[PDB]
Structures are given as structure tokens and as C-alpha cells.
């Protein structure tokens, strides 16, 4: 009832739309979408404890205190979006695709945190989807 999570990474262009995206809606419905280039569209409801786990992971990462202005912006090579709502706070971060790169950029600590949180979240989603439907990236 008070949590929302959305992650997207991909590229749109003349050869179509290449991307991955998952959304955890407030009522616990998980939507998983993946465009190769093959296409996967899957939906399922996760128990409240999965939702609370995600909330915990995010809170522990402390990504909510970061900001994306210092980060590389999205370009026409790729783009990623991390959108989260936890109580009163709402973030909708944006940057390019994806590590050594983050280190020599502005706010390496923040971009590193973003990087690891995205890997931890992907990991949970891949486990949920992989096991519940027998699928994968």
C-alpha cells in the first residue's frame, strides 16, 4: 500500500526496442518485460514479505539520499531508470547503461551504490521469475 519500485534499462531505435523492465506495483503485482534483439511478458503477485524485503534492501542501500544530476545522462546508446516510492519519498533516477567507469566520474560513491543496488534488485527479480515461470534474460 505504500511501496513502489520500477527499473528499466534498454534502447529504442530503428531496429526496434531492446530492453528489460520490472515493476512492483503497490498491491504486490510484479510485471516483468524483456525485449531481446524473442520477447517475454510475465505477471504475478508476490507475497507481502517479498515487498518488505525489497523495501529493506533499498533502505539499506540508502539510494534514496542520492541524486542523479552528477551522473552521466541517458544518451542514444542506452538508458536506465530507477524509480522508487517509499512513504513520503519518491525518486525517479536516470542515467546511461551501466565497474571502473563509475570510479573516475562525478560522485563515484553514489554511482557505485546505484550500480550495486541495481545488481541486487535484478538478482531478486531473476530468481522470482526464473523459479516461478522457468525463464531468464
Amino acid at each position: 500500500e505504500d511501496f513502489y519500485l520500477r527499473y528499466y534499462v534498454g534502447h529504442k531505435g530503428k531496429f526496434g526496442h531492446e530492453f528489460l523492465e520490472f515493476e512492483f506495483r503497490p498491491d504486490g503485482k510484479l510485471r516483468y518485460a524483456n525485449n531481446s534483439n524473442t520477447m517475454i511478458r510475465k505477471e504475478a503477485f508476490v507475497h507481502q514479505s517479498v515487498m518488505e524485503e525489497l523495501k529493506r534492501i533499498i533502505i539499506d542501500s540508502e539510494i534514496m539520499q542520492e541524486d542523479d544530476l552528477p551522473w552521466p545522462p541517458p544518451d542514444r546508446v542506452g538508458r536506465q531508470e530507477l524509480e522508487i516510492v517509499i512513504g513520503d519519498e519518491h525518486i525517479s533516477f536516470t542515467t546511461s547503461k551501466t565497474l571502473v567507469d563509475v570510479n573516475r566520474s562525478k560522485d563515484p560513491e553514489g554511482l557505485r551504490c546505484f550500480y550495486y543496488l541495481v545488481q541486487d534488485l535484478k538478482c531478486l527479480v531473476f530468481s522470482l521469475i526464473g523459479l516461478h515461470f522457468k525463464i531468464k534474460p
Binding site: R25, P26, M39, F45, V46, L69, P74, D88, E89
Partner: protein
């Protein structure tokens, strides 16, 4: 594959939630268990960071035949995240483990056990 069902209620639940938010930032602004394909999955939380699959496999194995166990590790620290997906062959086994293990402990820490997917 299959197109997502239209979901007006859900779509508007998201709207309310987002419009109730009083702190914004980012360039972005610019009941009832459900069975999985090969069995029943439980979601385990509050797992000790020093715990490894072996310990999970061990404590859950007595309740039925475990088809899969995902004890994901933290991507930065290498320790385990704090959660795990345990999949049993039957609903009975999964329910038994769930009733017996929710509240139990692994490496001295209390864990919680629930259904992973619902209806």
C-alpha cells in the same frame, strides 16, 4: 508472450501513491498461495549474513523434497543478502516447513517464512 492485462485499479493506485509523495528528485521528472511451474516456493527472510546454502538446505530438507534453493549473495560484500527462495515439490511439504520454520532460527538469528507468490 502474453500482453499485460489492463489494470485500471492498479494504475490508479500507483497514481494516488505518487501524488501523495512530498519529496521528489531525479531526471525522471523532467491471501492464498499460488503454485509455481515446478512446485511451491516459500520466501525466507532475516537470514544471517554468514549463512550459506548448505545451512538452508539442511534446515528445510526434513519437510519435503527441495526442488531449488536460491540463497542470493550481496553483490558487493559477497555475504548472503538476507533472503532465500525454497521450492518444494508439494503444497503439503511447503506448508509444513512454513509452519515449523517461521520463527525458528539459523545461526542464532530468527527467520521468517512465507509464501512467495499469491493470488
Amino acid at each position: 508472450a502474453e500482453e499485460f492485462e489492463v489494470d485500471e485499479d492498479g494504475d490508479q493506485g500507483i497514481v494516488r501513491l505518487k501524488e501523495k509523495a512530498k519529496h521528489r528528485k531525479g531526471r525522471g521528472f523532467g491471501p492464498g498461495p499460488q503454485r509455481s511451474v515446478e512446485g511451491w516456493i516459500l520466501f525466507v527472510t532475516s537470514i544471517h549474513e554468514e549463512a550459506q546454502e548448505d545451512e538452508i538446505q539442511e534446515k528445510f530438507c526434513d519437510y519435503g523434497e527441495i526442488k531449488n534453493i536460491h540463497l542470493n549473495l550481496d553483490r558487493r560484500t559477497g555475504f548472503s543478502k538476507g533472503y532465500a527462495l525454497v521450492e518444494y515439490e508439494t503444497h503439503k511439504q511447503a506448508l509444513a516447513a512454513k509452519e515449523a520454520l517461521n520463527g525458528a532460527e539459523i545461526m542464532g538469528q530468527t527467520i521468517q517464512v512465507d509464501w512467495c507468490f499469491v493470488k
